[PDB]
């Protein structure tokens, strides 16, 4: 006990904390290992995802090497602050912290061969720009970028410890509106004016779930358009009936579009769902204009040719519109 105490104090003694291991020698080599716990809500409005993980950095420091005391020591909160650790940081994070309750979720373990293992429990909100042009039929690519802040590749090299097995816990993710199709681990040397900095990238590919939108967006619009087509089969002299039908279908379409864009994320630029809804709106508007033409031509100014043409052309045109939309966006 006291032997361990005085040996740890001696290990602290003679240690320069501002100097990395092997300052004049070859660069330090740090192996990263991530254990994902969960991916929380993913925001289209903010274009970011919140990720919780256990982040581990493994390296070798000959300064912190001891002989005897076969057990591997474990510094916890106070003397841990008196050791050099890499200045690793997440390039694209927007807000992150180490969990505090009950105690600081940090760990430092020193093996007798000078090896150091530094574990942290980190929650981080990372930026993920999204291509919301095929929304809700879109597929996204989010990334987490890990980089050294001050040291270039000549001083520190990073790598994935364990190779492709470095990152674990991907299966634990249970996002409601997204499914993780694939993930990748990449290592690069980004070149700045100062020099080549190390970089690691943990990338996920997400595919959105579509049945929600099929249930609440595409089906009601199609049903409302089919209802709007009923005017062509209603008698042409039923002015109040046909006018009420057409204008109320238009009102229902506007109601659907407005409340849909209220409940959906803001997303202040064009999507695919907007084009589909606008197509349905134009179809019902054209149906009402068709009745207006009928009323002016006949009964104003043996079914009539205008309605006979409408009955066959409107479903046919809507089918072609659906075909073009689905082929273009799928």
């Amino acid at each position: 006990m006291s032997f361990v105490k005085e040996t740890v104090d001696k290990l602290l003694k003679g240690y320069d904390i501002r100097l990395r291991p092997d300052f004049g020698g070859p660069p330090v080599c740090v192996g990263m290992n991530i254990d994902i716990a969960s991916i929380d809500m993913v925001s289209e409005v903010n274009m970011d995802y919140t990720l919780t993980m256990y982040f581990q950095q493994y390296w070798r420091d000959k300064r912190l090497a001891y002989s005897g005391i076969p057990l591997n020591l474990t510094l916890d909160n106070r003397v841990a602050d008196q050791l050099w650790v890499p200045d690793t940081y997440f390039l694209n994070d927007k807000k992150s912290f180490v969990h505090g309750v009950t105690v600081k979720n940090r760990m430092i373990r020193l093996h007798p061969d000078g090896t150091v293992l530094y574990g942290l429990r980190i929650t981080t909100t990372a930026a993920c720009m999204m291509d919301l042009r095929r929304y809700p039929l879109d597929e996204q690519n989010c990334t987490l970028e890990i980089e050294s802040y001050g040291y270039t590749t000549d001083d520190i090299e990073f790598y994935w410890r364990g190779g492709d097995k470095a990152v674990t816990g991907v299966e634990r993710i249970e996002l409601p509106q997204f499914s993780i199709v694939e993930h990748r681990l990449v290592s690069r040397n980004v070149v700045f004016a100062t020099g080549a900095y190390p970089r690691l990238s943990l990338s996920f590919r997400l595919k959105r779930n579509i049945g929600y939108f099929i249930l609440q967006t595409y089906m009601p619009s199609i049903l409302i358009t089919i209802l709007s087509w009923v005017s062509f089969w209603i008698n042409y002299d039923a002015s109040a009936a046909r006018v009420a039908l057409g204008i109320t279908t238009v009102l229902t379409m506007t109601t659907i579009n407005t409340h849909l864009r209220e409940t959906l994320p803001k997303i202040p630029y064009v999507k695919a769902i907007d084009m589909y809804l606008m197509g349905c709106f134009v179809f019902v508007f054209l149906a009402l204009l068709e009745y207006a033409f009928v009323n002016y031509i006949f009964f104003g100014r043996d079914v009539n040719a205008i309605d006979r043409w409408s009955r066959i052309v409107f479903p046919f045109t809507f089918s072609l519109f659906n075909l073009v939309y689905w082929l273009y966006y799928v």
Partner: nanobody
Amino acid sequence: GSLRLSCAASGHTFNYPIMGWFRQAPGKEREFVGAISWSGGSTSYADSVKDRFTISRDNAKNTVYLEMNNLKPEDTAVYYCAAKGRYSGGLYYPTNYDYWGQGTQVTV
């Protein structure tokens, strides 16, 4: 040799999302063959049989399919299916898995 095993789950399947396939040859202990998540993505296979086997899922009927393309004579064993909690731990350790199956037999 196209063999397809099927592990069907009933009950509170949501509370035990991850499902893992193991194999136990005669004499040898249980070995982790594969694991599949709830949503059907992010499958994880062992090093020995990473490319030979493929695991699929369909929650509409609560069943997990383990396909095998090319079988070797070291693969003769009793194949088990198991379920794991959401905060159990690692995938490769059978102790973390709570509910096991009787297990089928395969010989080649």
